[PDB]
Design an enzyme around this catalytic site. Structure first.
Site, PDB file in Angstrom:
ATOM      1  N   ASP A   1      44.781  34.231  36.589  1.00 15.75           N
ATOM      2  CA  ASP A   1      44.826  35.528  37.031  1.00 15.75           C
ATOM      3  C   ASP A   1      45.460  36.813  35.862  1.00 15.75           C
ATOM      4  O   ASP A   1      44.507  37.468  35.564  1.00 15.75           O
ATOM      5  CB  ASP A   1      45.805  35.516  38.314  1.00 15.75           C
ATOM      6  CG  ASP A   1      45.604  34.387  39.328  1.00 15.75           C
ATOM      7  OD1 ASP A   1      44.356  34.257  39.468  1.00 15.75           O
ATOM      8  OD2 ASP A   1      46.512  33.806  39.506  1.00 15.75           O
TER       9      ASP A   1
ATOM     10  N   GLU B   1      37.996  33.762  36.256  1.00 19.86           N
ATOM     11  CA  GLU B   1      37.338  32.639  35.942  1.00 19.86           C
ATOM     12  C   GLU B   1      37.263  32.339  34.430  1.00 19.86           C
ATOM     13  O   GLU B   1      37.920  31.489  33.868  1.00 19.86           O
ATOM     14  CB  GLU B   1      35.994  32.291  36.516  1.00 19.86           C
ATOM     15  CG  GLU B   1      35.704  31.152  36.194  1.00 19.86           C
ATOM     16  CD  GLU B   1      36.767  30.261  36.375  1.00 19.86           C
ATOM     17  OE1 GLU B   1      37.045  30.216  37.677  1.00 19.86           O
ATOM     18  OE2 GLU B   1      37.235  29.425  35.655  1.00 19.86           O
TER      19      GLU B   1
END
Lengths: 596, 619, 566
Positions: free
Chosen positions: C464, C408
């Protein structure tokens, strides 16, 4: 470049069906030569060899010619024409005619070609080569074999035969015993008979007997005799321990067997084929004298085979001895020399007429080849029809033949590049040629006598051993193969090829270049095409179950296992497809068994 | 990490003489656990045998007592004429009314225990057992394996001429005869092997069994009756069995070829008593005591057991130990198993349930004479030629006085000093020998990984049989009912094993289809003995306690290490080419227990462990 | 040398269950990792998240049932029981939270972090945005008339026939008007505010629900609506209707998305160790990510409004009042609670902008992040089974929480995250832009398994790559502090810690899906298609290839052209 000539297109059309260029030819092979064929041809409603393909072709052409001053050819023509097709009664009559058990057994065998308990029919002896001699030998039995219940399948089918019989009344359970009787009878016969691989000590299976106990003349039932030779002291004893009640379950067996023979009694083949089996020289005489063309076959082979032999043979004392042998070999091409007509009729002079038709043939074939006994011994005959497709080599005559039949399908054609034919006919011929030097043939000698053609026998066993290793470590897809029982003819082809290939090479070294890229798959030399051909011949797919079925029972290996093994054992080919080393078709690692 | 004990240090010491950490663990597992033991020696079992023997020797260093004593004292210390009369009890090779070749045989058997034209062991019936019976059967050929078919690798031709050249040194002065007759005593031999049954067929005893009595053979053949006197009012009528009703049925130049062969053989393995010359063609205490160890079996046994250890102790241990194995093995049941079925289960389960133990001594062997009743008759006279001949006379004569009494089910097959169990599915039994209640196979105060890999393994290693495609045949109690369909499943599954051994060569092979059976037990036993050791150790959860000689290894791994240490056996190579060959047994049957592949830390996709068809899960 | 602490055994079962040893651990890494989890499960899409999400929802039904004496709770309870069984458009939006013709919601203005400017964006349809309009797919086109006539006759005549093709057509004409997502990747352009007098009954439109500047994210679609303009009403009915075709789940889920507060307070209070356990993990990553212009984002992070767990404005007083605008009594509820949820978020407009807001229920699992204000959000639900439970090998809690955190966090530094500053505002960075092409290209050199493309998702793709690639380094550090936690999980003694860490991480993602929804998924999300995700993002992290030392050539280790980074 391409000899545009049509027939060459025809040769390329037969080479296109099963080309499968999708898979790399240096990776695997058998795929690259038959996978098409497996694919396009759905399994005709088992094994459908290119051979049986041929078989259809020729046997058809036979039929085509038949229909049409003419004696035996007429005999056949009638015989066949009686095929388009109750008569169980007839059989029942036979049994009744029978029901001194032996002489019975004799005559049954005799007039019905059904061999049981003593599979006997004569030839020259080995040890004294002019003297015809009988033989007596363990029978040949439906299953070939422990583990299996396939036994009980045999059971079910037996009881069902005699059941379907039980239709006719001219006791609806006792059959369900007679069954188990004849089954465990199979079991005894087998469990004493001899399995195969051990059928090579011709040294052994020769012990002679003339005029053991429990015997009745029984030769009568076949028609101072010579010494009947008995190839299984083991077996032909084991009958003696297996003998007024006896008659009930022992005759029980010979019936059910004889019955099981012909249950079933464009399909025209079926019966025509049978005819070729039984009146062989007849249908042969048809085939040749209906195709009549000699030049293209009285020579090309009789050019080829001579080339081949000479090459292979030439690639101590042995080399000579063997040479004199091959140089000696009687070599019968196309067909024998009893073929105008009369004399054809004259040997074949034992039939005439307006299951009876079938019964007249069965007993005529059992006598036909067994009638030479009265006459002097010979080195000059066939084993079987010149209308099959095969090539056989009965060293007992040191005879190599080539039934004219094959020489049309993809093993030979006249107007084709020397490639094709040096891979078809050329191969199977050179196969034969050597097939008399493996541990079957090697035990014989330029007459058919026996001391030993061969010590270098060492080097021989050195070949055999390693080859069996390679095999039992190169297992077909669908679970593996046998050793020796496979080397039996493997070693043959493994050699015969290299022979034929050298032959091609030297040949084309005798006629300049000639290498005419072939006009439907234009992208090769001939050489590649030569491989591609020999590959082709064996293109056949088979019933997955019948795959393993005929995995064991076939003397010689599954198709694929062969074609993509034999190749692996050739440095030459290894070149011809300019491949890289350390691949799936290279024994730098799992070394080639350089057979010669 | 580990404890500082004197016993564990010994178990840790032994570990260190086998291994190698240098070589990769998964790349050829065989070498990973037995490299050293190979490197030095010039093997394991033979080792243990030497041990137990020398033990028996120190024991004997002082009436079975005296019998075996005298025996050995002979066998260390000690021409032709006498046995010549024996030979001249027929007539010989060179230069007659038609003799009952058997009568000759029967004599020679009962007098030398020299099986020809029949190996004939005699015991519990197969399928009506309350009784005993004869198993008249083909020989067991001198040349190991019917190898009278596939290569011409027979120089016994010449191990024959020479070893038969005795005569022109015995009593004569004419070779051409002697040669041709040597070739012949072969050529018959062939004409035998090509009529016995190669082991493959010798599974389903169901077809061996053929009860006959001289009535029926007389009807079957040309002499049996007249033979059987060679073997005490007999039970001729009692059900006899011609296991192989294949007798090839059979003259001057052919009759006496027998008597040649027969005599070839007799002398061929009694050259010892002959003059020191011919013995050539063949340790002192080792060879000797071993001769005993298969001749007056229980003697040396009783010596060993009631000599060197406290029976109660090891016996009471191994009782529960085995019981553990057999139990969890039962736990490997239908619930566990695949090719089986409900009632087939219940039955075979029960076959276990009603199945027997026996350890060390017979139930007899410990008023302490009664053993010296069993071995009673054996005359003692140092007052060796006569000796041996006598002792064999006993071993078998003992075997057959057993005939006419009633059948038991506590049969002690063999002398309780051979380091191997056995399980005679004829009757049903599981006897284990004290002589195994010992080193690497076992010890009292060693880690249990071992006492399951040793005594434990072998316990299971054998016990399996009573579910092989041989065990299925004989029921729980000993009979023929095809205990279990499931079969098809079974055989198919076995074919995995088949190919497995068939594609991984030791020397440079060892075709699998032949040795199937014992191969399967390789798995079964070990599979169990693991699953047990798991269970046991979980019950505590403490034994782990890595080994002093080496922290590195796991309380688990060492199990496999030990098992695959049992078979540490530097088979020299001539002996390798002349059960299965060991290195195979270790490597292969290690593959198939993926439990291993994991518990030995090594990545999968490796040539110790195969993918999805991971394991021929037949147990 | 392994461990046998029972808490680790519980977590072991989960990972081992999906893990497969049949396949090698280098080739098709994703495959080996969870081939099991594919081949075990029954049959829409279903995946590890949906797994947990289930678990927790079960749990909340449980506790819900257990205590039934705050009124808030009481509400959710009665709800659950009950479930087990111009001006125009606006007015409807109000009453339904079902959008058409304009999607409308409110939050902090992007110019300044004070006033709550009105965002009017183009709307999202039940089906994907740019799936309609291509010389292409022929999907369902009637299913509209299908479902209409179904309930139609139940209401009871063929107007249906035309009405369908017509309304569908209105759609088709609305879709291609929208903007693909290929370029909702730039806030420089959407922001272009207008007043309440610029609209030329939009005044009335809003009066369905202001004097403030109003913001239109899309001026090309907004201007197209003026050219569009009665029968349209049909359309809206359709959608409204079209809203409404074990129920334990679907019920509690509806709850989740609609009573997005009570649920969390009734689950998290049915706890001081958990918040403190992840407090260090969150502070560990952030700094490690940092250690690698620089100053600005440096600040940004150091000022990012972390928020563990769940809101702090969750005695009862607040929880009561915040949701007190409810009153729900004894499934008209569906309506009732649809009209309260959308109004609760629209009522905030009047109030001044905050830095603590909570964008969604603390019930489900995805660490959502608003660059809008500036906020991670790791709703308490997530930190759980197999992401992180209080006592697992640090292997996991890093591969779990630590991950989805990092994935995140890094958003603040992607395609979008760049163009916001910690305030929540705007203004060699080109260097980074290079990398974009790199990933999306190299990535696009790989595909999906059933199409076979992914040039939109470099957003989450890079999110990611970074997040994890960092996190792992973080764990490495953590243990560099101690050097013993390496006690390898029991029931699997063939992987080292680092191995595990990966293995976990992979497992976090597995899923077994019908091909149809797969190809739809492909073009309806900001995601790689999971297999592509795992395999690819691991084609990049070097440390992974290292720990597995899968030598060169094997199709996961082409370092030759290296792996672009951030």
């Amino acid at each position: 470049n391409a000899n545009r000539s049509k027939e060459w297109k025809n040769a390329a059309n037969t080479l296109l069906f099963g080309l499968d260029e999708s898979v790399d030819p240096c990776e695997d092979f058998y795929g690259f030569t038959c996978n098409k064929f497996i694919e396009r041809i759905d399994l005709d409603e088992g094994r459908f060899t290119t051979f049986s393909q041929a078989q259809l072709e020729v046997n058809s052409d036979i039929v085509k010619a038949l229909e049409k001053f003419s004696q035996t050819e007429r005999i056949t023509k009638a015989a066949f024409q009686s095929c388009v097709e109750a008569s169980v009664n007839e059989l029942l009559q036979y049994i009744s005619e029978r029901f001194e058990l032996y002489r019975e057994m004799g005559r049954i065998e005799q007039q019905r070609a059904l061999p049981t308990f003593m599979y006997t029919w004569v030839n020259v002896d080995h040890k004294n080569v002019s003297r015809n001699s009988y033989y007596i030998s363990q029978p040949t039995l439906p299953m070939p074999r422990q583990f299996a219940p396939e036994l009980d399948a045999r059971t079910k089918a037996i009881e069902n035969v005699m059941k379907a019989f039980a239709s006719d009344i001219l006791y609806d359970k006792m059959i369900k015993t007679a069954a188990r009787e004849v089954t465990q009878i199979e079991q005894k016969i087998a469990m004493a008979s001899w399995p195969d691989d051990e059928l090579r000590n011709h040294e052994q299976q020769y012990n002679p007997y003339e005029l053991n106990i429990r015997f009745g003349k029984y030769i009568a039932g076949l028609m101072f005799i010579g010494d009947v030779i008995v190839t299984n002291p083991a077996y032909m004893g084991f009958l003696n321990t297996l003998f007024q009640m006896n008659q009930y379950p022992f005759v029980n067996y010979i019936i059910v067997h004889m019955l099981f023979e012909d249950a079933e009694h464009d399909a025209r083949m079926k019966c025509v084929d049978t005819i070729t089996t039984y009146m062989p020289y007849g249908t042969g005489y048809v085939y040749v004298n209906s195709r009549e063309d000699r030049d293209q076959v009285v020579e090309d082979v009789k050019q080829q085979t001579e080339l081949i032999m000479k090459t292979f043979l030439k690639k101590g004392e042995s080399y000579r001895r063997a040479e004199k042998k091959i140089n000696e070999m009687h070599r019968n091409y196309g067909w024998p020399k009893k073929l105008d007509d009369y004399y054809s009729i004259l040997e074949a002079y034992n039939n005439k007429t307006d299951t009876i038709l079938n019964i007249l043939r069965r007993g005529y074939e059992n006598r036909e080849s067994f009638r030479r006994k009265n006459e002097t011994a010979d080195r000059t005959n066939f084993l079987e029809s010149p209308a099959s497709v095969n090539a056989w080599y009965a060293p007992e005559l040191n005879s190599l033949t080539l039934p004219f039949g094959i020489l049309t399908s993809p093993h030979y054609d006249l107007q084709f590049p020397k490639a094709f034919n040096f891979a078809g006919s050329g191969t199977v011929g050179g196969h034969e040629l050597v097939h008399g030097f493996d541990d079957e043939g090697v035990q014989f000698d330029y007459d058919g006598s026996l001391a030993d053609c061969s010590k270098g026998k060492n080097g021989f066993k050195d070949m055999a051993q390693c080859v069996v290793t390679q095999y039992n470590a190169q297992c077909c897809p669908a679970h593996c193969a046998n050793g020796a029982h496979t080397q039996g003819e493997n070693i043959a082809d493994l050699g015969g090829l290299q022979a034929s290939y050298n032959a091609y090479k030297e040949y084309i070294k005798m006629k300049g270049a000639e290498e005419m890229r072939l006009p439907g798959l234009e992208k090769f030399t001939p050489n590649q095409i030569f491989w591609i051909s020999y590959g082709y011949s064996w293109c056949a797919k088979e019933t997955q179950s019948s795959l393993v079925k005929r995995l064991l029972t076939n003397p010689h290996s599954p198709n694929s296992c062969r074609v993509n093994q034999v190749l692996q054992d050739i440095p030459s080919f290894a070149k011809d497809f300019q491949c890289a080393l350390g691949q799936k078709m290279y024994p730098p690692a799992e070394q080639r068994c350089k057979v010669w």
